[PDB]
Amino acid sequence: STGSATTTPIDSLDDAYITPVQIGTPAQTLNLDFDTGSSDLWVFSSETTASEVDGQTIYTPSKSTTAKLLSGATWSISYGDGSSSSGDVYTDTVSVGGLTVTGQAVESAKKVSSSFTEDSTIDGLLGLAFSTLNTVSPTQQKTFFDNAKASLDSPVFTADLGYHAPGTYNFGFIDTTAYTGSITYTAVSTKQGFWEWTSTGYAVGSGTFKSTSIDGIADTGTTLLYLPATVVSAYWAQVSGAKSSSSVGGYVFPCSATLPSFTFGVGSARIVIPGDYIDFGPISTGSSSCFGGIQSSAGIGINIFGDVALKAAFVVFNGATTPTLGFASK
Numbered sequence: 001s002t003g004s005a006t007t008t009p010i011d012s013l014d015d016a017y018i019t020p021v022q023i024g025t026p027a028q029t030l031n032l033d034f035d036t037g038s039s040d041l042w043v044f045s046s047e048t049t050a051s052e053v054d055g056q057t058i059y060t061p062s063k064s065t066t067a068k069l070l071s072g073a074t075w076s077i078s079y080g081d082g083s084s085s086s087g088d089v090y091t092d093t094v095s096v097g098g099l100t101v102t103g104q105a106v107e108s109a110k111k112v113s114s115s116f117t118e119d120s121t122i123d124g125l126l127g128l129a130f131s132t133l134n135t136v137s138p139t140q141q142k143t144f145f146d147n148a149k150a151s152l153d154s155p156v157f158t159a160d161l162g163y164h165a166p167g168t169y170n171f172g173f174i175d176t177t178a179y180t181g182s183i184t185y186t187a188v189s190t191k192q193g194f195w196e197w198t199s200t201g202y203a204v205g206s207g208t209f210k211s212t213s214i215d216g217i218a219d220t221g222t223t224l225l226y227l228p229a230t231v232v233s234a235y236w237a238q239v240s241g242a243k244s245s246s247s248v249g250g251y252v253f254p255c256s257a258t259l260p261s262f263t264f265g266v267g268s269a270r271i272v273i274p275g276d277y278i279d280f281g282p283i284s285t286g287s288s289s290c291f292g293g294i295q296s297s298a299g300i301g302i303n304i305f306g307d308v309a310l311k312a313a314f315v316v317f318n319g320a321t322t323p324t325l326g327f328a329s330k
Contacts, residue, residue: 001100001151001152001172002098002099002152002153002170002171002173003020003033003095003096003097003098003099003148003149003152003170003171003172004097004098004168004169004170004171004285005019005020005021005097005168005169006019006166006167006168006270006293007019007034007161007162007166007167007168007169008161008166009165009166010119010121010122010258011121012164012269012281013280013281014161014162014163014164014223014307015223016033016119016122016189016223017033017034017122017126017161017167017205017220017312018032018033018121018122018123018306019031019032019033019034019096019126019169020032021094021095021096021111021126021229022093022094022095022096023043023059023061023064023092023093023094023106024061024063024064024065024067024092024093025064025065025092025093025163026064027095028057028059028060028063028064028110029057030043030044030057030058030059030123030124031057031122031123031212032122032124032125032126033122033123033124033125033126033127033221034126034159034169034220034221035125035126035127035128035219035220035221035223036042036126036127036128036129036159036194036195036217036219036220037080037127037129037194037195037217037219037220037222037304037315038077038079038125038127038129038133038219038221039127039129039130039131039132039133039134039135039184040075040107040126040127040134040135040136040142040192041094041105041106041107041124041125041126041127041143041144042075042077042085042087042106042107042108042109042125043058043059043106043108043109043123043124044056044057044109044112044116044123044124044234045058045059045060045061045087045088045108045109046058046059046061046108046214047088047108047110048064048087048108048109048110048111048112049110049111052111052112052116052117053117053118053328054090054118054120055120055121055158056120056122056123057073057123058123058202059106059108059123059124061090061092061108063268064092066092066102067090067091067106068090068091068092069088069089069090070088070089070090070091070105070136070139070141072123072138073088073089073105073136073137073139073141073211074086074087074088074089074136074137075087075089075107075135075136075137076135077135077243079221080222080300080304082113082116082317083113083115083116084112084113084131085109085111085112085113086110086111086199087107087108087109087110087111088107088108088110089106089107089108089136089143090105090106090108090140091103091105091107091302092104092106092323093105094106094144096126096144096169096171097161097169097170097171098181099152099171099172101144101147101148103147103317104144104147105134105136105141105142107136107141109124116133118135125221126144126246127143127144128143128145128157128220129193129194129195130143130146130190130193130227130316131146131196132141132190132193133193135196145317146251146319148171148172149319150230152328153169153170153172153173153236154172154173155318155319156171156172156173156174156316156317156318156319156320157169157170157171157172157303157317157319158170158174158175158178158211158314158315158317159310159315159317160175160179160309160315160330161218161220161307161311162210162308162312163274163276163277163312166195167311170230175317178314178330179313179314179326179328179329179330180328180330181241181329182269182328182330183275183314183316183326183327183328184266184267184268184269184323184326184327184328185267185316185318185324186267186324186325186326187200187317187324188324188325189324190323192217192302193328194217194218194219194288194302194319195217195219195237195323195325196215196216196217197216197217197218197325198213198214198216198266199213199215199216199264199265199305200212200213200216200265200266200267201213201214201264201265201268202214202215202227202231202258202262202263202264202265203262203263203270204234204235204238204261204262204263205238205260205262205275205293206260207238209263209265209267209270214227214228214231214264214303215302215303216251216302216303216304216305217302217303217304217305218304218305218310218315218317219304219306220306220307220310221306222279222304222306222307223293223306223307223308224280224293224294224304224306224307224308225262225278225293225294225295225304225306225308225309226258226295226296226297226302226303226304226306227268227271227294227295227296227297227298227303228296228297228298228303229296229298232251232294232295234251234298235258235260235262235294235309235318236251236292236294238260239253239257239260240254240257241254241257242254242257242292243255244296245289248283248291250288250291250292250295250296251291251295251296252283252289252290252292253289253290253292254290255281255282255287255288255289255290255291256287256288256291257290259275259276259278259279260275261273261274261275262275262276262278262294264305264309266327269327271284271309271311271312271313271329272329273308273309273312274312276317276321277308277312278292278293278294278308279292279293280292280293293308294308295296312329313327313328313329313330314327314328315327315330316328320324
């Protein structure tokens with residue numbers, strides 16, 4: 001089997017991407033944030049504290065003939081940005097782009113943090129990291145991909161995120177029309193539960209490539225590109241007037257600037273992030289200070305190849321017995 005679904009930016013900045021997901025019988029379609037950095041499929045629901053729901057579409061398990069309470073199971077998750085959610089668990093039928101999993105754990109939120117409430121466009125998350133990170137207790141549950149894997153034509157999914165445009169998540173096949181040149185594959189460590197890999201270096205603009213190992217995670221659920229302070233300083237030094245602002249919470253730059261591109265290495269291959277992908281617009285409405293899309297990972301504890309990086313590539317998440325990651329230009 002295979003599946004193919006369009007993923008759409010939630011706003012004009014590509015702050016996140018939403019993908020429609022069918023849950024239950026008859027189907028209830030919710031728009032979920034596909035997150036290769038976590039491993040829980042959780043949704044706003046009829047059980048979510050009413051004051052914490054503000055425009056989201058909810059899953060109502062009592063209206064699904066295939067929903068079953070997973071008795072005694074609870075979940076609770078916190079993300080890198082300090083947001084969080086928790087609740088109980090149902091199993092139900094879940095379909096993405098024509099690919100159906102029966103008995104998928106659907107984690108129903110009883111509580112969500114303010115950042116989730118305030119984002120009316122995101123009805124929940126669909127985790128695509130390794131199932132070892134799943135938070136359900138006392139019986140850990142599998143991701144949608146893990147459940148689907150044996151049925152797929154090939155044990156893979158691909159992320160093709162757009163810049164200010166829709167893109168595609170495919171399951172079970174590689175669309176050879178969706179990228180240019182060849183796909184370069186690179187080793188993955190699953191030791192921390194992430195799609196963790198080592199970039200071979202970087203360049204700023206038309207500058208020379210610096211060969212240096214940068215361990216990080218491919219994370220569709222993180223907006224920006226978080227890299228070591230040395231690398232990030234080298235990038236922003238090429239933008240007149242750019243500076244790190246403790247008050248704002250990262251590098252800012254004059255909105256009048258033209259940003260240089262940023263290249264990262266994948267083995268001997270190179271992925272080029274155009275300068276415009278690194279612009280996240282005014283820090284507040286009407287400001288002439290703009291927020292940068294490349295930020296320091298210092299104090300995160302891990303480097304994160306988030307959407308800024310991934311949307312410059314066609315990305316293969318290969319879930320074979322020994323997982324790997326592939327990157328192509330597009």
